[PDB]
Design a protein around this ligand. Structure first.
Ligand code: NA
Length: 121
């Protein structure tokens, strides 16, 4: 049907926009702290602590499968990256502080993405 096609085109354009968002967030992480999953072979107890691990490579995989149906879903995954880091790592660490800074800088990017998604429909 043409209605199905129109929904598919909308999902694709949302995907395009979420890609540009993902690239922008990732530019705020030049150290690449959040680029890849935590290795269960190097924080071996990680999964006793953190129930839903997340990272930018994992988000990129989901995005390439057009796996985010709306901005809220994408935001939830970004908030997991930040929130997991702030739980596992202490306040005094480089990791916790990098999560705080990414949250702050990512706020700006997400704030405009919400306006663009609303505006474009
Ligand atoms: Na903690």
């Amino acid at each position: 049907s043409m209605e199905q096609v129109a929904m598919e085109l909308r999902l694709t354009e949302l995907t395009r926009l979420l890609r540009s968002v993902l690239d922008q967030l990732q530019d705020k992480d030049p150290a690449r702290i959040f680029a890849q999953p935590v290795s269960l072979k190097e924080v071996p107890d990680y999964l006793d602590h953190i129930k839903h691990p997340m990272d930018f490579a994992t988000m990129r995989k989901r995005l390439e499968a057009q796996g985010y149906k709306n901005l809220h879903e994408f935001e939830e995954d970004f908030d997991l990256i930040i929130d997991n880091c702030m739980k596992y790592n202490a306040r005094d660490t480089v990791f916790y502080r990098a999560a705080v800074r990414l949250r702050d800088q990512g706020g700006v990017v997400l704030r405009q993405a919400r306006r663009e998604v609303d505006s474009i429909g």
